[PDB]
RNA sequence: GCUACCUAAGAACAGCUAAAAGAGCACACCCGUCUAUGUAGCAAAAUAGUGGGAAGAUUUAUAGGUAGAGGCGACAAACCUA
RNA sequence: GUAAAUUUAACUGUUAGUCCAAAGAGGAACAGCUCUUUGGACACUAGGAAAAAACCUUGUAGAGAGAGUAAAAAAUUUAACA
RNA sequence: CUGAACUCCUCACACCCAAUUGGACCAAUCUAUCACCCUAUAGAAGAACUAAUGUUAGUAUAAGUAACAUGAAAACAUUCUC
RNA sequence: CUCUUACUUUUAACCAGUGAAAUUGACCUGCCCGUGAAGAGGCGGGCAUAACACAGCAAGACGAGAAGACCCUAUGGAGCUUU
RNA sequence: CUCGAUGUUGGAUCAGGACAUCCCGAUGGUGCAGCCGCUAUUAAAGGUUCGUUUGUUCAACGAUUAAAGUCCUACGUGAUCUGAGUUCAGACCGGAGUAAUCCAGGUCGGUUUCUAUCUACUUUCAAAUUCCUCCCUGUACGAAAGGACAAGAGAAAUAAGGCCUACUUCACAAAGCGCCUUCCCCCGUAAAUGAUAUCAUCUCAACUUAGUAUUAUACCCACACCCACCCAAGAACAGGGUUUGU
């Protein structure tokens, strides 16, 4: 019976009837880490450089 | 067992004890034997105990009938209409007095299982819990994933 | 509350009249569909790779031998198309599946032995009810308007088709006939054990595994024969000559569809699409279409030289 | 697998089946109306129809006389077949007998049927009759039939 | 093999009172128009068939009296006549069976 | 009164071969080899078929005899009222 | 520190033993093996180790729709080379 | 933090071991004497049955299962089949 | 037998009549793995799961039947043999 | 644990499972030229013969085969069967014993019951495996002898599912000895590019390829005429037909 109250959808699509009776959105249990390119320039500038690479290194 | 017997909730008669206390015992009918050996304690109770007991309970009418009987009995009738018959067969005067006093203190309701050891007509003062008691409201009451002014 | 039939309360005079009345109406309804292309046909798209067309429903007349030009003998089954019409078309969205479906019926039967819901379904369609209805999965470009008649020229010689029908039911049968078990010897002491299954499981499990071969109903189930070559087509009597045997007894209704085997994929380029329309055909087809290797009855005797 | 089997399995075997039908057939010819279990009457009905066909061949036909000799255990019925029953159905090409179901036998509750030769002297069986043409349903259909004929002529 | 345990009445009631084992109500029962007694639609009326058989038995007894022994089947047709009736033109040359009663209404003369 | 053996006095054994027969083929009859069925069965030992013997140490009716520390036994520790 | 002990009078039952820890013997430094010794538990309660006679926690009995606890959950991831 | 019948809390307290042993009560029956809508004090004894493949009787279960039976027509005269 | 098949009779199944027996602690009587007096429908962890007839099957219910005939035990018997 | 019973060999029947793989598939190494082998990794979908002797499991032998796998399942399965063996009562021989009697010594004979109450089950998948021939080719390889693989073509066997035109057992039909149809993948490794470690390095580094399928598709799919009759449907029930209801 409890499973009959559980509704699963693979994607962002939800039926209109299911959407119209929603009440509260529970917070996601896990905080999604941001990729390297998602950091703003202020955050990148905030984090200090830790080492000085040699000037003659090819990298 | 509890499943094989009836049950009820804790209650009183006419909300007894709220405005005033009314003794629920209404009538006691004794049946003693003049010559019966099993009625020896019953005769002792009538000689010295029932007269003083009647003084302390002016609201209870006590009927003592002396007739031949093998098993003396006392019948207690209450205001709510319940009738309880108890045997005083071969009981001492002290045991009869304890039994009679026990009948006077009872409310007359059925002596069966009581589901809850408490009763209240107003269990809540601040408001009974509902799923929205601790849920904050949102602006314009928008549901999750709802678009306003499409 | 008592049950009734169509001619329970009819008088002596009325029974011949009612039979004539309904029979004439059925012939008129069938004759009204003889020109599908003059009654606003649906668009006819050219055949494309990956497109699946509709099949037919045919009645198994019997089997007949034929000989090829190399002298080999091939026995073929005659499948006659009898009153085959497209009944209902369901869109891809509404089919609940991966392809659109086309419903096909055949072998017009009496209206007096059909359900009211079925009778009113055919009343709107304007056709007499069909005995058997089969569902064919087709692509969007192969859609055909309901009520369009279907003929045995829908298939052509050299094509491979699949035939599906209910097999001959043999009732409750033992393991020896149903599953081909070896049974027990007839002599040397056997005591009331000659056709019995024997052991049905091992002692450790303490149970019979699901799907264990046991006596029971045999036959009377749908089976499909794949890769049946079409040798001959009779356009006059609407008869399809399919290679080998097909499931089911004679005079049974079968489901004929283009073969699903990978070797025969995308061989519908030269086949009619979405079907065959005799009314719109420029030149009337000959009475019998023969495969290139089939010895026609009027052909001379085979000479190896 | 009794697919295509048209002959019932009755009696003690194949020969006993013929003798059981022959006794019923012999009784049918003499009395022109007999009652028996429904299955046996239905099995015997086919033979009764073909017996009259042999009677139409005439008593001068050796084959017809031999067939009548075997199936009529009482030899007084052989003249009856070729001189009463066969001339009776001279103008009929079939339907010599009518078979109707009667209530079940009292003893073993067996399904019983009555079979007779048409045109006998016995009182008629309570044949089932269709509804009269004057009933409400038949009157409506008669009016429909008249309308179609009038339109066809026009 | 023998039962491992006794089957209870609760189990037995479910099997015995199952609708497959219960008697089915018949719907093909109708009143015979001739006599008013009940009959089935595909079955001849019991009252009327007995009426015909009673008259048939009387006629067959009269046939035996005229034949007067076994193997006496006539080679001519048979006509049954009742009181107050005379042979017709089409009945000449046929064996005549006489019944000492008035002709039944349902037995139409031919 | 079953059965083992015995006593008195009875009965039965077609046909064919050989004609001599504890001889052969083969009914009645006696027995019970093999197989199937049956296993609360028709039967507390049977049915169906196939078999052994069938003028002899044969089979069998009637009455009698031997009794348990025993009888009886062409020894199977058989049989002596399942 | 504790409250038992011996003696006198009168009897019954038990006298076919299991695992764990420990010191040993037999076997094979096998056994849910066999035989002794010291102690525990079981053949009585309850909780725990999943289910669980023998390990752990805990025992003296009733009612309560109070409370504090006892034992009580498995951790671990590795091969370059002058 | 959860967690016992451990311990505390309100009230009460003889009220959780086999064999065995001690003790307090008691159903029904008969008798003495009471009692007189079913009892009392004593004396007595064929004095208490969820179990012995227990005895007898009733009735289930398997089970409406296994199994059992009447050649055919007909005027019940008779005839027919084998 | 390779390698079975067809038909008939009996049985069978259905209808009507009559009506047994062994058996039976109670049963509201599933599967897998684990556990356990060492081989679980009933215990643990999972899985499966509207209800109820009829006909088949013989893997299990350590199936029914016979207080194991084998083995050992009993200061329990008996038959037979004997220096 | 079971002696108030848990029935023993081997066979028949039906097989379930394990992989420590006999055959078929994919790979690494070789004292791998090729053809045949040896060894190791991976793979349990499929298959794994017929006979003489023996009660046999085995074993020996004959003829084959791509191969005639190893084990578990109460030494799988006797309320399915067999009873040759083994294992009662008869008897014989050798041997032991004064005898009774005995001998994992041989030998002949020797009753295999059960009407299914419960559980379980009674159409899972409708994708197929393998050999041989021709061809490649007398090519690759090799001193010679010898002798492939891949691709392609054809014909069979088995298994699964059907069918009756002929043949055949047969004859309104059921059958095989007859005919018809039968479709995807298998992961072990072999290679690039390139870091830790500026070379290199197929990478439990990020990554690329052989290299993969939401196993594709197919089948099934509507519903009181229904008293009755018929049926290629069927034990009953159900199902199909009756516009073939004198
Ligand atoms: C061993 O053989 C034992 N089962 C005895 C068999 S005869 C009763
Ligand atoms: K008998
Ligand atoms: K005597
Ligand atoms: K055959
Ligand atoms: K079983
Ligand atoms: K045992
Ligand atoms: K395998
Ligand atoms: K042998
Ligand atoms: K069960
Ligand atoms: K590296
Ligand atoms: Mg069938
Ligand atoms: Mg066989
Ligand atoms: Mg035998
Ligand atoms: Mg037997
Ligand atoms: Mg047999
Ligand atoms: Mg088991
Ligand atoms: Mg049939
Ligand atoms: Mg019969
Ligand atoms: Mg003498
Ligand atoms: Mg003689
Ligand atoms: Mg002689
Ligand atoms: Mg005799
Ligand atoms: Mg003798
Ligand atoms: Mg002789
Ligand atoms: Mg004497
Ligand atoms: Mg003798
Ligand atoms: Mg001897
Ligand atoms: Mg002996
Ligand atoms: Mg003592
Ligand atoms: Mg031990
Ligand atoms: Mg100890
Ligand atoms: Mg003990
Ligand atoms: Mg626990
Ligand atoms: Mg305590
Ligand atoms: Mg707590
Ligand atoms: Mg407490
Ligand atoms: Mg206490
Ligand atoms: Mg009392
Ligand atoms: Mg007393
Ligand atoms: Mg007593
Ligand atoms: Mg009792
Ligand atoms: Mg008892
Ligand atoms: Mg009953
Ligand atoms: Mg019955
Ligand atoms: Mg039964
Ligand atoms: Mg029966
Ligand atoms: Mg019989
Ligand atoms: Mg009979
Ligand atoms: Mg049966
Ligand atoms: Mg009984
Ligand atoms: Mg009993
Ligand atoms: Mg339930
Ligand atoms: Mg259940
Ligand atoms: Mg288990
Ligand atoms: Mg469970
Ligand atoms: Mg069943
Ligand atoms: Mg048993
Ligand atoms: Mg068993
Ligand atoms: Mg015993
Ligand atoms: Mg012994
Ligand atoms: Mg002993
Ligand atoms: Mg002793
Ligand atoms: Mg003694
Ligand atoms: Mg038992
Ligand atoms: Mg085997
Ligand atoms: Mg297998
Ligand atoms: Mg491996
Ligand atoms: Mg592996
Ligand atoms: Mg393979
Ligand atoms: Mg290599
Ligand atoms: Mg075994
Ligand atoms: Mg078994
Ligand atoms: Mg065996
Ligand atoms: Mg033997
Ligand atoms: Mg000797
Ligand atoms: Mg020895
Ligand atoms: Mg012998
Ligand atoms: Mg032997
Ligand atoms: Mg046996
Ligand atoms: Mg058996
Ligand atoms: Mg059975
Ligand atoms: Mg079923
Ligand atoms: Mg090649
Ligand atoms: Mg086949
Ligand atoms: Mg680099
Ligand atoms: Mg670099
Ligand atoms: Mg590189
Ligand atoms: Mg490199
Ligand atoms: Mg209906
Ligand atoms: Zn009537």
Q: How determined? A: cryo-EM
C247 and C163 in contact (C-beta within 8 Å)? yes
Which stretches within C33-86 are classed as H helix?
A: none
Q: Could you tell me if D142 lies within 8 Å of chain C, comparing CB atoms?
A: yes
Sign of CA dihedral B13, B17, B19, B24: positive
| Inter-residue contact E53 to D31 (CB < 8 Å) | no
Tokens of C170: 């043999």
Q: Tell me how far the alpha carbon of residue D35 lies from the centroid of ligand 20, in angstroms.
A: 59
Ligand 84: centre distance to CA C56 (Å): 28
Q: Is C169 helix (H, G, I), strand (E, B) or coil?
A: coil
In eight-state DSSP terms, residue C68 is B
Beta bridge partners of B61: B27
- Only one residue has tokens 């962002």, namely A12
Measured CA angle at C229 (ends C224, C235), to 5 deg: 105
Please tell me whether any atom of strand H lies within 7 Å of the Cβ of D73. Answer: yes
The pair phi, psi for residue D60, each rounded to 5°, is -75, -15
Distance from residue A38's CA to nucleotide J240's C1', rounded to whole Å: 70
| Structural domain includes residue E101 | yes
Cβ atoms of C73 and C67 closer than 8 Å: yes
Contact E67, E76 (CB under 8 A): no
Nucleotide lying nearest to B114, CA to C1' measure: G65
- C1’ H3 / CA A29, Å: 29
Identify the burial level of C29 via C-beta atoms within 10 angstroms of its C-beta, where 0-12 means exposed, 13-18 middle and 19 or more buried.
middle
Stated in angstroms to one decimal place, the resolution of this structure is 2.9
Buried b (16+ CB within 10 A) or exposed e, B93-132: beebbebbeebbeebbbeeeeeeeeeeeeeeeeeeeeeee
Give Cα separations from D23 to C118, D29, D75, D111, D119 (angstroms): 50, 10, 13, 19, 22
Residue of A nearest to B141 (CA): A23
**Percentages (nearest 5) of helix, strand, coil residues in chain E:** 25, 15, 60
Strands C288-290 and C239-243: unpaired
The helix (run of H) or strand (run of E) holding residue B94 is: helix B93-105
CA distance A52 to C303: 97
Q: Is C59 within 8 Å of C80 (Cβ atoms)?
A: yes
Mutate: best of C11, C12, C176, partner D, most D CBs <10 A: C11
Residues E28, C1: C-beta atoms closer than 8 Å: no
Contact B50, B97 (CB under 8 A): no
d(CA D56, CA D85): 9
Q: Which two tokens stand for residue B67?
A: 């007739």
Element of type H or E holding D52: helix D38-56
| Residues B86/B76, Cβ–Cβ less than 8 Å | yes
Task: Count Cβ neighbours within 10 Å for each residue of D35-48 and write b for 16 or more, e otherwise.
Answer: bbbbebbbbbbeeb
User: Which residues of chain A have a CB within 8 Å of the CB of B143?
Assistant: 19-20, 22-23
Is nucleic acid strand H under 7 Å from E57's C-beta? yes
CB of A26 within 8 Å of a chain B CB? The answer is no
CA-wise closest residue to C246 among C270, C228, C219, C266:
C228
Please state at what angle helix D14-31 crosses helix D38-56, rounded to 10 degrees. Answer: 70
Helix, strand, coil percent values for chain D (each to nearest 5):
50, 10, 40
> CA–C1' span, C224 to G40, in Å?
76
Which residues in chain E, range 1-30, keep a C-beta under 7 Å from any nucleic strand I atom? 1-8, 10-11, 14-15, 18, 20-21
Residues 237-266 of C with CB under 7 A from strand J: 243-252, 255, 257, 260-263
Question: Cβ of D19 < 7 Å from strand I?
Answer: no
Q: Do A25 and B135 touch (CB under 8 A)?
A: no
- The sign one gets for the Cα dihedral C136, C142, C148, C151 is negative
E32 is in an annotated binding site: yes
Any domain includes E80? yes
Which CATH number is D10-120's, of 3.20.20.140, 3.40.250.10, 3.40.190.170, 3.90.1030.10?
3.90.1030.10
Ligand 16 centroid from CA C213, angstroms = 21
- How far apart CA C121 and CA B112 sit, in angstroms, is 67
Listed residue (D9, D122, A23, C236) closest to E108, CA to CA: D122
DSSP A4: G
C-alpha C194/C-alpha B29 separation (Å) is 89
Q: Is C142 exposed, middle or buried (0-12, 13-18, 19+ CB in 10 A)?
A: buried
Q: How far apart are CA D94 and CA D84, in angstroms?
A: 16
For chain A, which chains pass the contact test of at least 3 CB pairs under 8 Å? B
* Exposed e or buried b per residue across C217-232, where buried means at least 16 C-beta atoms within 10 angstroms of its C-beta: ebbeeeeebeebbbbb
Cα C129 to Cα C111: distance, rounded to the nearest angstrom: 6
Q: CB of D84 within 8 Å of any CB in chain E?
A: yes
The answer on whether E48 is annotated among ligand-binding residues is yes
- Does E14 count as an annotated binding residue? no
User: Which of the residues A23, A26, A27, A28 would you substitute to probe the B interface, choosing the one with the greatest number of B C-beta atoms within 10 Å?
Assistant: A23
According to the annotation, is E53 in a ligand binding site? no
Q: Which chains touch C (3 or more CB pairs under 8 A)?
A: D, E
Rounded CA-CA distance C269/C15 in Å is: 52
Helix (H, G, I), strand (E, B) or coil at B28: strand
Burial-class residue B40 by CB neighbours within 10 Å (0-12, 13-18, 19+). Answer: middle
Q: Identify the helix (H) or strand (E) that includes residue C81.
A: strand C73-81
Given CB atoms, is C25 within the 8 Å cutoff of chain D? no
Residue E88, in any domain of the structure:
yes
What are the backbone angles phi and psi of residue E80, rounded to the nearest 5°? -95, 125
Pairing assessment for the beta strands E78-81 and E95-98 based on DSSP bridges: parallel
SS3 D125: coil
E contacts of D125 (beta carbons < 8 Å): 44, 49, 52
For residues D67 and D54, the answer to whether their CB atoms sit within 8 Å is yes
Kind of pairing, strands E38-40 and D112-117?
unpaired
Other beta carbons within 10 angstroms of residue D67's beta carbon come to 18
Report the distance separating Cα C53 and Cα C257, nearest Å: 9
Tokens of C198: 């024997």
Report yes or no: C10 at the D interface, CB cutoff 8 Å: yes
CA of C216 to C1' of G14 (A): 66
C172 CA distance to ligand 65 middle (Å): 28
Alpha-carbon gap, residue D39 to D115, rounded angstroms: 12
Rounded (10°) CA dihedral D54, D59, D64, D69: 110
CA of C120 and C1' of J99: distance in angstroms? 107
CA distance D1 to chain C (A): 6
- Nucleotide closest to residue D3 (CA–C1'): J173
D62-71 and D38-56 helices, crossing angle to 10° = 150
Distance from CA of C5 to the nearest CA of E (A): 12
Instruction: Please indicate whether, in this complex, the C-beta atoms of B145 and A19 are within 8 angstroms of each other.
Output: yes
Query: D63: Cβ–Cβ under 8 A, 6 or more apart, which residues?
Result: D54, D57
Let me know how many helices (H) and strands (E) chain E has, helices first.
2, 4
| Through-space separation of residue C23 CA and nucleotide J180 C1' in angstroms | 39
What spacing in Å lies between the alpha carbon of C59 and ligand 76's midpoint?
81
DSSP C103-143: EEEEEE--GGGS-HHHHHHHHHHTSPPEEEEEEEEE-GGG-
Domain residues for the domain of E80 are: 27-108
* Number of structural domains in chain E: 1
Q: Is B106 left (phi over 0), alpha (psi -120 to 50) or beta?
A: beta
Residue pointed to by tokens 């990148």: A44
Cα–ligand 88 centroid distance for C295 (angstroms): 66
Interface residue ranges in chain B relative to chain A, Cβ cutoff 8 Å: 135, 143-146
Q: How far is it, in rounded angstroms, from Cα E68 to Cα E78? A: 16
Contact status, residue C152 vs residue C285, Cβ threshold 8 Å: no
Q: Is residue E17 in a domain? A: no
User: Taking the domains of chain D in order of start, what are their residue ranges?
Assistant: 10-120
To the nearest whole Å, the CA of A35 is away from the closest chain B CA by 25
Question: For residue D81, which of D23, D25, D132, D10 has the smallest C-alpha distance?
Answer: D25
Element (H, E) at C67: strand C56-67
Distances (CA, A) of E55 to C56, C64, E13: 62, 61, 51
Q: Is the separation of the CB atoms in E43 and D105 below 8 Å?
A: no
- What span, in angstroms and rounded, lies between the C-alpha atoms of D79 and D64? 12
Please judge whether D33 and E42 are an interchain contact, meaning their C-beta atoms are less than 8 angstroms apart.
Answer: no
How many alpha carbons lie under 13 Å from residue D146 in its C-beta half-sphere? 6
Peptide bond into E90 cis (omega under 30): no
Q: Is C284 helix (H, G, I), strand (E, B) or coil?
A: coil
Q: Which residues are within 8 A (CB) of B68 and not within 5 positions of it... i.e. 6 or more apart?
A: B33, B34, B35, B36
Pairing assessment for the beta strands B25-32 and B61-66 based on DSSP bridges: parallel
D112 vs D104: CA distance, rounded Å? 5
- β-bridge mates for residue C130, sequence order: C108
Q: Which nucleotides of I are covered by protein (CB under 7 A)?
A: 1-10, 15-16, 22-32, 39, 41, 51-61, 63-64
CB E38 within 8 A of CB E30: yes
CA–CA gap between residue C301 and residue A8 (Å, rounded): 72
The DSSP bridge partners found for residue C172 are C217
Give distance CA B37 / C1' H33 (Å).
12
CB contact under 8 A, E74 and D80: yes
Rounded to a whole number of angstroms, the distance between the first and last alpha carbons of chain E is 70
Say if the Cβ atoms of E77 and D126 lie within 8 Å.
Answer: no
Distance of CA C18 to the CA centre of its chain: 31
Neighbouring C-alpha atoms within 13 Å toward the C-beta of C303: 4
**Does nucleic acid strand I have an atom less than 7 angstroms from the CB of C187?**
yes
CA distance C11 to chain D (A): 5
Note the residue count of chain B: 150
- The gap between C189 CA and J87 C1' (Å) is 21
Are C82 and C276 spatial neighbours (Cβ–Cβ below 8 Å)?
no
Show the tokens assigned to D84.
């009463």
Which residues on neighbouring strands pair with residue C229, listed in sequence order?
C160
Distance (Å, whole) CA B12 – CA C1: 60
């Amino acid at each position: 019976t409890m499973m009959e109250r559980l509704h699963l959808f693979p994607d962002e699509y939800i039926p209109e009837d299911i959407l119209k009776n929603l009440v509260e959105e529970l917070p996601q249990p896990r905080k999604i880490p941001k990729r390297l390119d998602e950091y703003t320039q202020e955050e990148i500038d905030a984090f200090p450089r830790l080492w000085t690479p040699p000037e003659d290194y090819r990298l | 067992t509890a499943r094989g017997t009836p049950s009820r909730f804790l209650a009183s008669v006419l909300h007894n004890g709220l405005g005033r206390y009314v003794q629920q015992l209404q009538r006691l009918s004794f049946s003693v034997s003049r010559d019966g050996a099993s009625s020896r304690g019953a005769r002792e109770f009538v000689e010295r105990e029932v007269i003083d007991f009647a003084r302390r309970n002016p609201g209870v009418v006590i009927y003592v009938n002396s007739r031949p009987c093998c098993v003396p009995r006392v019948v207690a009738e209450y205001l709510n209409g319940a009738v309880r018959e108890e045997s005083i067969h071969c009981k001492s005067v002290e045991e009869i007095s304890t039994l009679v006093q026990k009948l006077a203190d009872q409310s007359g309701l059925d002596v069966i299982r009581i589901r809850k050891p408490f009763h209240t007509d107003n269990p809540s003062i601040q408001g009974q819990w509902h799923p929205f008691t601790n849920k904050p409201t949102t602006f314009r009451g928008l549901r999750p994933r709802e678009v306003q002014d499409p | 509350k008592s049950g009734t039939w169509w001619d329970e309360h009819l008088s002596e005079e009325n029974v011949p009249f009612i039979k004539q009345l309904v029979s004439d109406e059925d012939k008129a309804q069938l004759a009204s569909k003889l020109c599908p292309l003059k009654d606003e046909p649906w668009p006819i798209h050219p055949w494309e790779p990956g497109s699946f067309r509709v099949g037919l429903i045919a009645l198994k007349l019997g089997m007949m031998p034929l000989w090829t030009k190399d002298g080999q003998k091939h026995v073929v089954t005659l499948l006659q198309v009898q009153d085959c019409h497209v009944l209902k078309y369901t869109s891809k969205e509404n089919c609940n599946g991966k392809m659109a479906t086309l419903s096909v019926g055949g072998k017009t039967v009496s209206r007096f032995r059909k359900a009211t819901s079925i009778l009113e379904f055919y009343r709107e369609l304007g056709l007499p009810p069909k005995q058997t209805v089969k569902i064919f999965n087709i692509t969007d470009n192969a859609a055909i308007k309901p009520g369009t008649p279907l003929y045995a020229a829908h298939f052509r010689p050299g094509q491979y088709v699949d035939v599906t029908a209910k097999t001959i039911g043999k009732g409750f049968q033992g393991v020896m006939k149903r599953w081909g078990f070896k049974g027990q010897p007839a002599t040397h002491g056997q005591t009331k054990t000659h056709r019995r299954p024997g052991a049905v499981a091992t002692g450790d499990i303490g149970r019979v595994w699901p799907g264990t071969k046991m006596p029971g109903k045999m036959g009377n189930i749908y089976r499909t024969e794949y890769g049946l070559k079409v040798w001959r087509i009779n356009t006059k009597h609407n008869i399809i000559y399919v290679n080998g045997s097909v499931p089911g007894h004679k005079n049974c209704l079968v489901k004929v569809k283009d073969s699903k085997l990978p070797a025969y994929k995308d061989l519908g380029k030269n086949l009619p699409f979405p079907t065959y329309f005799p009314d719109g055909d420029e030149e009337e087809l000959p009475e019998d279409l023969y495969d290139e290797n089939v010895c026609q009855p009027g052909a001379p005797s085979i000479t190896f030289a | 697998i009794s697919h295509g089997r048209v002959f019932r399995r009755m009696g003690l075997g194949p020969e006993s089946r013929i003798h059981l039908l022959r006794n019923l057939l012999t009784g049918l010819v003499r009395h022109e109306r007999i009652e028996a279990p429904w299955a046996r009457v239905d099995e015997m009905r086919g033979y009764a129809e073909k017996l009259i066909d042999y009677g139409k061949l005439g008593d001068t036909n050796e084959r017809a006389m031999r067939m009548a000799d075997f199936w009529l255990t009482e030899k007084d019925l052989i003249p009856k077949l070729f001189q009463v029953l066969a001339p009776r159905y001279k103008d009929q090409t079939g339907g010599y007998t009518r078979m109707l179901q009667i209530p079940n036998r009292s003893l073993d509750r067996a399904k019983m049927a009555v079979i007779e030769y048409k045109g006998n002297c016995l009182p008629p069986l309570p044949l089932p009759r269709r509804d009269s043409h004057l009933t409400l349903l038949n009157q409506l259909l008669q009016g429909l039939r008249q309308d179609l004929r009038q339109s066809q002529e026009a | 093999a023998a039962p491992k345990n006794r089957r209870t009445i609760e189990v037995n009631r479910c099997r015995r009172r199952n609708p497959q084992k219960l008697i089915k109500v018949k719907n093909n029962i109708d009143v015979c128009p001739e006599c008013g007694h009940l009959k089935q639609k595909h079955v001849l009326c019991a009252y009327c068939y007995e009426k015909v058989c009673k008259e048939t038995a009387e006629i067959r007894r009269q046939i035996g009296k005229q034949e007067g022994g076994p193997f006496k089947a006539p080679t001519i047709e048979t006509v049954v006549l009742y009181t107050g009736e005379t042979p017709s033109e089409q009945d000449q040359g046929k064996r005549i069976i006489e019944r000492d009663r008035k002709r039944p209404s349902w037995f139409t003369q031919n």
